[PDB]
Design an enzyme around this catalytic site. Structure first.
Site, PDB file in Angstrom:
ATOM      1  N   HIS A 181       0.775  -1.100  -0.032  1.00 40.38           N
ATOM      2  CA  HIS A 181       0.007   0.127  -0.031  1.00 40.38           C
ATOM      3  C   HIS A 181       0.914   1.477  -0.146  1.00 40.38           C
ATOM      4  O   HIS A 181       0.117   2.311  -0.445  1.00 40.38           O
ATOM      5  CB  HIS A 181      -0.810   0.011   1.258  1.00 40.38           C
ATOM      6  CG  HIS A 181      -2.000  -1.109   1.286  1.00 40.38           C
ATOM      7  ND1 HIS A 181      -2.990  -1.255   0.273  1.00 40.38           N
ATOM      8  CD2 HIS A 181      -2.138  -1.826   2.145  1.00 40.38           C
ATOM      9  CE1 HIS A 181      -3.596  -2.425   0.667  1.00 40.38           C
ATOM     10  NE2 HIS A 181      -3.223  -2.885   1.755  1.00 40.38           N
ATOM     11  N   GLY A 183      -2.339   1.934   5.186  1.00 40.94           N
ATOM     12  CA  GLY A 183      -2.779   0.794   5.495  1.00 40.94           C
ATOM     13  C   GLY A 183      -1.539   0.015   6.089  1.00 40.94           C
ATOM     14  O   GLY A 183      -1.383  -1.179   5.984  1.00 40.94           O
ATOM     15  N   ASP A 203      -4.284 -12.494   5.132  1.00 42.23           N
ATOM     16  CA  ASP A 203      -5.552 -11.945   5.803  1.00 42.23           C
ATOM     17  C   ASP A 203      -6.866 -12.476   5.041  1.00 42.23           C
ATOM     18  O   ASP A 203      -7.870 -11.920   5.336  1.00 42.23           O
ATOM     19  CB  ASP A 203      -5.572 -10.260   5.624  1.00 42.23           C
ATOM     20  CG  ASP A 203      -4.690  -9.891   4.588  1.00 42.23           C
ATOM     21  OD1 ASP A 203      -4.487 -10.536   3.481  1.00 42.23           O
ATOM     22  OD2 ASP A 203      -4.441  -8.721   4.665  1.00 42.23           O
TER      23      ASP A 203
HETATM   24  C1  LIG Z   1      -5.430   0.659   8.085  1.00 37.53           C
HETATM   25  N1  LIG Z   1      -6.148  -0.379   7.445  1.00 37.53           N
HETATM   26  C2  LIG Z   1      -5.648  -1.424   6.876  1.00 37.53           C
HETATM   27  C3  LIG Z   1      -5.221  -1.302   5.495  1.00 37.53           C
HETATM   28  C4  LIG Z   1      -4.589  -2.377   4.954  1.00 37.53           C
HETATM   29  C5  LIG Z   1      -4.438  -3.711   5.482  1.00 37.53           C
HETATM   30  C6  LIG Z   1      -3.794  -4.719   4.681  1.00 37.53           C
HETATM   31  O1  LIG Z   1      -3.829  -5.813   5.307  1.00 37.53           O
HETATM   32  N2  LIG Z   1      -3.368  -4.565   3.667  1.00 37.53           N
HETATM   33  O2  LIG Z   1      -3.055  -5.667   2.849  1.00 37.53           O
HETATM   34  C7  LIG Z   1      -4.959  -3.744   6.931  1.00 37.53           C
HETATM   35  C8  LIG Z   1      -5.523  -2.600   7.392  1.00 37.53           C
HETATM   36  S1  LIG Z   1      -7.615  -0.244   7.434  1.00 37.53           S
HETATM   37  O3  LIG Z   1      -8.070   1.184   7.398  1.00 37.53           O
HETATM   38  O4  LIG Z   1      -8.503  -0.811   6.326  1.00 37.53           O
HETATM   39  C9  LIG Z   1      -8.077  -1.005   8.952  1.00 37.53           C
HETATM   40  C10 LIG Z   1      -8.603  -2.350   9.227  1.00 37.53           C
HETATM   41  C11 LIG Z   1      -8.654  -2.484  10.398  1.00 37.53           C
HETATM   42  C12 LIG Z   1      -8.303  -1.719  11.448  1.00 37.53           C
HETATM   43  C13 LIG Z   1      -8.342  -1.591  12.818  1.00 37.53           C
HETATM   44  C14 LIG Z   1      -7.377  -0.774  13.438  1.00 37.53           C
HETATM   45  C15 LIG Z   1      -7.506  -0.922  14.869  1.00 37.53           C
HETATM   46  C16 LIG Z   1      -8.475  -1.596  15.569  1.00 37.53           C
HETATM   47  C17 LIG Z   1      -9.324  -2.384  14.828  1.00 37.53           C
HETATM   48  N3  LIG Z   1      -9.211  -2.470  13.526  1.00 37.53           N
HETATM   49  S2  LIG Z   1      -7.803  -0.251  10.705  1.00 37.53           S
HETATM   50 ZN   LIG Z   2      -4.505  -6.940   3.446  1.00 36.15          ZN
END
Ligand SMILES: CN(c1ccc(C(=O)NO)cc1)S(=O)(=O)c1ccc(-c2ccccn2)s1
Ligand SMILES: [Zn+2]
Ligand SMILES: [K+]
Ligand SMILES: [K+]
Length: 352
Positions: free
Chosen positions: A121, A129, A245
């Site tokens: 990302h 991300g 994931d």
């Molecule tokens: C930052 N984010 C990402 C972006 C990419 C990934 C990923 O795995 N990319 O491959 C994971 C989370 S997001 O905004 O979609 C989130 C997902 C889950 C989040 C979260 C953060 C804190 C507590 C609970 N959930 S933030």
């Molecule tokens: Zn992911």
């Protein structure tokens, strides 16, 4: 040699463990790999820290300097909190993928593994991300010192936007991504209509998938598109990201895969017998991600692994079951046979 290279050093693992949103996953991953004594069967290579000049082959000096400063908008904050020593964290990952790249450019290695890498990302001047540095891109840029056509295959649950945007205008690299594509789902991009721009048009293939997809169906889609892409494009080298994931039991709760499905995909890419850089990625159920990657490590090695989990430091973390296999939930597969075929036909046309 022909033994795959395994990027590892205790300093690296511990540096990777310090990631705030995914504490200890590196050790867990390595520990389980070590527990099956999978290592000692691969060529262990210490990671080299990426220099400013190297990381800047993609990221801007503005972004690099800034990042180095807070380690003491650029997308920093909630999702990407610039914790103390984050710049070092980033440089070690980036360095690590670049050294896996060099391992491939040179010989005595058909596969180079860096389970701690794969943050697709990150933009050239912005964290995103949970991704601070785009190591996948840095690896690709390194590989291009010797290879004129690189194939990037992203199997993370999320769209590989960072790596795709990096090469959207070039036909030297082709980025292929299978991901969930739904309205409010991050990063909210990568429809099948996305094919790249200008000189890169048709060199960006995206496979939008829906919730509930399982091993079989997922693999048919994957092999279908990969086979098609191997035909039209003549990849000399390959960069593969395997974010776990997508595995049943992930907090992300979207796909319903098991490491075996993702396994057939790996076996498919490994049979082309090309220089292959293996990377990690997402994976928020620390125990499953470890199970996934050590198993895939076995698939890279061909040696089938013992179903029961070997005693080690994190033995307890293996739920109540204590087995290597992961069982999909009983959720439905929201992927209708017609739309998948439609998607495939679209790209199939595109590939020329
Ligand atoms: C930052 N984010 C990402 C972006 C990419 C990934 C990923 O795995 N990319 O491959 C994971 C989370 S997001 O905004 O979609 C989130 C997902 C889950 C989040 C979260 C953060 C804190 C507590 C609970 N959930 S933030
Ligand atoms: Zn992911
Ligand atoms: K993906
Ligand atoms: K491209």
């Amino acid at each position: 040699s022909l033994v795959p290279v395994y990027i590892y050093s205790p300093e690296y693992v511990s540096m990777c463990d310090s990631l705030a949103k995914i504490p200890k996953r590196a050790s867990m991953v390595h520990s389980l790999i070590e527990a099956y004594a999978l290592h000692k069967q691969m060529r262990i290579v210490k990671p080299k820290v990426a220099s400013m000049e190297e990381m800047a082959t993609f990221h801007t000096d503005a972004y690099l300097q800034h990042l180095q400063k807070v380690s003491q908008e650029y997308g920093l904050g909630y999702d990407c909190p610039a914790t103390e020593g984050i710049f070092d964290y980033a440089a070690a990952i980036g360095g690590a993928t670049i050294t896996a790249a060099q391992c491939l450019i040179d010989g005595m290695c058909k596969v180079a593994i860096n389970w701690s890498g794969g943050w697709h990302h990150a933009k050239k001047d912005e964290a995103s991300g949970f991704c601070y540095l785009n190591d996948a891109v840095l690896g690709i840029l390194r590989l291009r010192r010797k290879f004129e056509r690189i194939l990037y295959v992203d199997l993370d649950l999320h769209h590989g936007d960072g790596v795709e945007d990096a090469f959207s205008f070039t036909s030297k690299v082709m980025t292929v991504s299978l991901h969930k594509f739904s309205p409010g789902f991050f990063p909210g991009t990568g429809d099948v209509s996305d094919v790249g721009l200008g000189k890169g048009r048709y060199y960006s293939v995206n496979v939008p998938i829906q919730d509930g997809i399982q091993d079989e169906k997922y693999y048919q889609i994957c092999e279908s598109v990969l086979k098609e892409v191997y035909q039209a494009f003549n990849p000399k080298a390959v960069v593969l990201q395997l974010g776990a994931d997508t595995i049943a039991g992930d907090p992300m709760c979207s796909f319903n895969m098991t490491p075996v499905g993702i396994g057939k995909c790996l076996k498919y890419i490994l049979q082309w017998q090309l220089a292959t850089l293996i990377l990690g990625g997402g994976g928020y159920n620390l125990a499953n991600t470890a199970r996934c990657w050590t198993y895939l490590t076995g698939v890279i090695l061909g040696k089938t692994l013992s179903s029961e989990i070997p005693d080690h430091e994190f033995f307890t973390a293996y739920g109540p079951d204590y087995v290597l296999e992961i069982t999909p939930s009983c959720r439905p597969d929201r992927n209708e046979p017609h739309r998948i075929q439609q998607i495939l036909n679209y790209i199939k046309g595109n590939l020329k």
